[PDB]
Design goal:
Layout lengths: L1 E9 L2 E9 L4 E6 L5 E6 L5 H4 L16 E8 L2 E9 L6 H9 L4 E5 L5 H8 L13 E8 L12 E8 L2 E6 L8 E2 L4 H15 L3 E4 L6 H11 L14 E5 L2 E5 L4 E4 H8 L7 H9 L8 H8 L5 H33 L3 H5 L3 H15 L10 H8 L14 E10 L2 H8 L15 E3 L6 E3 L5 H20 L5 H18 L2 H6 L8 H26 L2 E6 L2 E5 L5 H18 L6 E12 L5 E5 L2 E3 L15 H12 L5 H12 L22 H4 L32 H9 L15
Parallel strand pairs: 8-12, 10-11, 12-15
Antiparallel strand pairs: 1-2, 2-3, 4-6, 4-7, 5-6, 8-9, 9-10, 13-14, 16-20, 16-21, 17-18, 19-20, 21-22, 22-23
Helix pairs in contact: 9-15, 13-14, 13-17, 14-15, 17-18, 19-20, 19-22
The structure holds nickel (II) ion.
PDB class: transferase
Keywords: transferase
Assembly: monomeric
Length: 729
């Protein structure tokens, strides 16, 4: 199985390295055959002689043009004849590219900024992460001794935790004595231990959490002061640091630094991304967080280390588990795109698409256009985004169904063969003209992008077919990922067309796919109504909600499945429509804000969450009261009554005590600081909570929990009357 590829330099010439793991153990394949190169568009195949003489200077040596050969390729369908220029060393290209592009007999140059290593992959047509190869994984994390003054990495590293398929274990110097804490000498010895564990367990993947910006950088500054060789490299090298915009990224040659943060940030949606926050949001279990402030003054005093150790041990036990959750998909994304898992894992969809098209270009012999120059790059970002979500049909509805197009946006691209190499193609006998915007897209020959999309959608169909018939979960979940990557890849093309740095940028395509989207949806929203007595409830690109006023949950469903067959045999080939689900009751409030309930309970809803970190107090409880009364009970004059019935209680000082202790932390520092010369509840009326305020015969609350908690929570959901009658008099 190919893990990755990189190149070393020997005698001035580049030597490619293929890191892999075949039937059991590590192994590097070397190849010094591959040659660097890039393209050039010349005014006349004559000046090739004036050009093959141009030279540059790198490292005080001299960069020359090795060999050269003319070739024929397909630049956006249209025939092109360019010269392929070969060089001796990858770092030659970047030192002479502009010099060659600046020549007079040169109109333009192409494919001159592609990581030599990646290039090799697309040419030899090698695909990483393939075959049935089980990679050994190891998770590690570290907690250090902090101090606000500290410049950086000043304090020493207290522990190094590591989880495996065998368990977690922590390595620290001071004493603890727990079955899971390893004995070492000093800080220097600890780091040394870890190192000896890694080289020892010889893992294929090193998993960390934000270890791209913290763990490695630290371990570096510490390995320097302590005079140690951090040889995690499968070759003996030390992690190599890299640029990633405003942040950084760390490699470990021969292995795979699978940092979970960038991957988790792209997948799950949350307002806070602490490991504890994450773990919770992923497996539904609580995570105990121990803060530095506490750690510092815990490893010094004496013991509390049994606590810091646990927190440490877990940090790594959690990271490992999350590792197995998110690596599988990102690993299939790899195999689908044709690049390292290291790369794909730290990549946005636009690039995942850019790597696909670059590879597919090589196969199809299509010359790739170039990336945009700053002037243009900026110009593209200036575009206007104007979402279109028809307004919700205010009110409560029953026996609602949801229908969404099976791959809407990709279906259009295919159906209407939308692509930059078909846009404004003169001399065609056939064309499709995007609604509104009116872009002419020649249908004569299938366009590049669309051609690819078709295959992709086709195969994922193949997969889903073979996936509803296998039984063996390992042979099913296996496939399950494949078709999810394909789906992920596909829905990524629309955005890619507008992604300002896209080689295959196409604003016209994007505009078109949007306009068609509208048209198609709208045509359905209408066709279902006038011909099937449905009343479109809510709607947003992709799908929509609907029902037939007053109709058994069966009639609606029976009438539903009917419509599908109708417009389906109606609409194009790709464009198809499917039954999403059924929600016995629900109401809608503005854009992406609503709530529904299925036939077996369960309140989905996603419309208007906006929690308060903790349960806030009474709000996070009466919130449910209402919703449940609105959906399940379906009693409008009840949930609102539930408010006026509670506003006549809390203001009257009746609602329990602990049900007011706002579980928050970091006025704000009122009671907070009011305990001086980490976190703690409070039930002011500016006042702290304990057995000192509430005698149930002297102290009470305040009239805020009614206008700053209970009320503001349901005020929105409650759509019909103003809160002027939610307090009652
Ligand atoms: Ni950490």
């Amino acid at each position: 199985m190919i893990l990755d590829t990189d190149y070393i330099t020997e005698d001035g010439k580049p030597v490619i390295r293929i890191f892999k793991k075949e039937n059991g153990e590590f192994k590097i394949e070397y190849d010094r055959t591959f040659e660097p190169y890039f393209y050039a568009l010349l005014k006349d195949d004559s000046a090739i002689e004036e050009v093959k003489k141009i030279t540059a200077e790198r490292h005080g040596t001299v960069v020359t043009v090795k060999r050269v050969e003319k070739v024929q390729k397909k630049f956006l369908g249209r025939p092109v004849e360019v010269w392929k220029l070969y060089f001796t060393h990858p770092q030659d290209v970047p030192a002479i590219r502009d010099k060659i592009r600046e020549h007079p007999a040169v109109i333009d140059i192409y494919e001159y900024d592609i990581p030599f290593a990646k290039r090799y992959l697309i040419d030899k047509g090698l695909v990483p992460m393939e075959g049935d190869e089980e990679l050994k994984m190891l998770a590690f994390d570290i907690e250090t001794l902090y101090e606000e003054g500290e410049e950086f990495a000043e304090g020493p590293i207290l522990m190094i935790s590591y989880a495996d398929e065998e368990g977690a274990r922590v390595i620290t110097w001071k004493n603890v004595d727990l079955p899971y804490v390893d004995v070492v000498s000093t800080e220097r010895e600890m780091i040394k231990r870890f190192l000896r564990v890694v080289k020892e367990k010889d893992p294929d993947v090193l998993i960390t959490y934000n270890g791209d910006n913290f763990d490695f950088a630290y371990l570096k500054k510490r390995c320097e002061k302590l005079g140690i060789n951090f040889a995690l490299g499968r070759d003996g090298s030390e992690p190599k640091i890299q640029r990633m915009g405003d942040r950084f990224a760390v490699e470990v040659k021969g292995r795979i630094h699978f940092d979970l943060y960038p991957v988790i940030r792209r997948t799950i949606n949350l307002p806070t991304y602490t490991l504890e926050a994450v773990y919770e949001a992923v497996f539904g279990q609580p995570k105990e967080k121990v803060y530095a402030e506490e750690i510092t003054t815990a490893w010094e005093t004496g013991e509390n280390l049994e606590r810091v150790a646990r927190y440490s041990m877990e940090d790594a036990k959690v990271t490992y588990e999350l590792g197995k959750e998110f690596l599988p998909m990102e690993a299939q994304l790899s195999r689908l795109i044709g690049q390292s898992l290291w790369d794909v894992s730290r990549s946005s969809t636009g690039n995942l698409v850019e790597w696909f098209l670059l590879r597919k270009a090589y196969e199809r012999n299509e010359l790739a256009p170039n990336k945009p120059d700053e002037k243009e790059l900026a110009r593209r970002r200036q575009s206007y985004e104007g979402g279109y979500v028809k307004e919700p049909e205010r009110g409560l509805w029953e026996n609602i169904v949801y229908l969404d197009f099976r791959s809407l946006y990709p279906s259009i691209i295919i159906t209407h063969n939308v692509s930059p190499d078909t846009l404004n193609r003169e001399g065609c006998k056939e064309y499709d003209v995007a609604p509104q915007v009116g872009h002419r897209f020649c249908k004569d020959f299938p366009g590049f992008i669309p051609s690819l999309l078709g295959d992709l959608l086709e195969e994922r169909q193949k997969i889903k077919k073979k996936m509803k018939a296998t039984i063996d979960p390992i042979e099913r979940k296996l496939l399950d990922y494949r078709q999810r990557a394909i789906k992920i890849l596909a829905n990524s093309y629309y955005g890619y067309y507008g992604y300002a740095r896209a080689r295959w940028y196409c604003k016209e395509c994007a505009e078109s796919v949007t306009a068609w989207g509208r048209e198609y949806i709208t045509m359905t929203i209408k066709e279902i109504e006038e011909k099937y007595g449905f009343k479109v409830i809510y709607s947003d690109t992709d799908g929509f909600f609907a029902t037939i006023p007053g109709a058994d949950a069966e009639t609606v469903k029976k009438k539903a499945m009917e419509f599908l067959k109708y417009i389906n045999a109606k609409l194009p080939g790709a464009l198809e429509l499917e039954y999403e689900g059924f929600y016995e009751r629900g109401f809608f409030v503005t854009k992406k804000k609503y709530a529904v309930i299925d036939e077996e309970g369960k309140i989905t809803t996603r419309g208007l969450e906006i929690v308060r970190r903790d349960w806030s107090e009474i709000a996070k409880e009466t919130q449910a009261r209402v919703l449940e009364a609105l959906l399940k009970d379906g009693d409008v004059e009840k949930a609102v009554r539930i408010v006026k019935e509670v506003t006549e209680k809390l203001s009257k000082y009746e609602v329990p005590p602990e049900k007011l202790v706002i579980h928050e932390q970091i006025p704000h520092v009122a009671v907070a600081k009011r305990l001086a010369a980490t976190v703690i509840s409070y039930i002011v009326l500016r006042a702290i909570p304990f057995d000192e305020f509430d005698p149930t015969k002297h102290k009470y609350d305040a009239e805020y929990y009614i206008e700053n908690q209970v009320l503001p929570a349901v005020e929105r959901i409650l759509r019909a009357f103003g809160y002027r009658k939610e307090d009652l008099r």
